[PDB]
């Protein structure tokens, strides 16, 4: 998921901040791929508008 569709869907930070339940600068502070916690709440909020997958989330081998 990245931070540049989320923005697109949400259309102010301050709004996805909103919907997982964070203050606007976690927002902001996201990178090309937003956290994995923030993203699956994400699927949600936007009533399953983002698919979550465990591409980008992966790092354990």
Partial sequence: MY????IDHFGT???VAK???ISDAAV???????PEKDA???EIVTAGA???????YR???
Avoid: F
Avoid at 50 to 56: D, I, S, T, V
């Fill in 3 to 6: 931070k540049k569709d989320v």
């Fill in 13 to 15: 930070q301050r709004a």
């Fill in 19 to 21: 919907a997982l339940g």
């Fill in 28 to 34: 902001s502070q996201w990178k090309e791929v937003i």
């Fill in 40 to 42: 699956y709440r994400l």
């Fill in 50 to 56: 983002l698919k979550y997958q465990e591409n980008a």
């Fill in 59 to 61: 790092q354990a081998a």
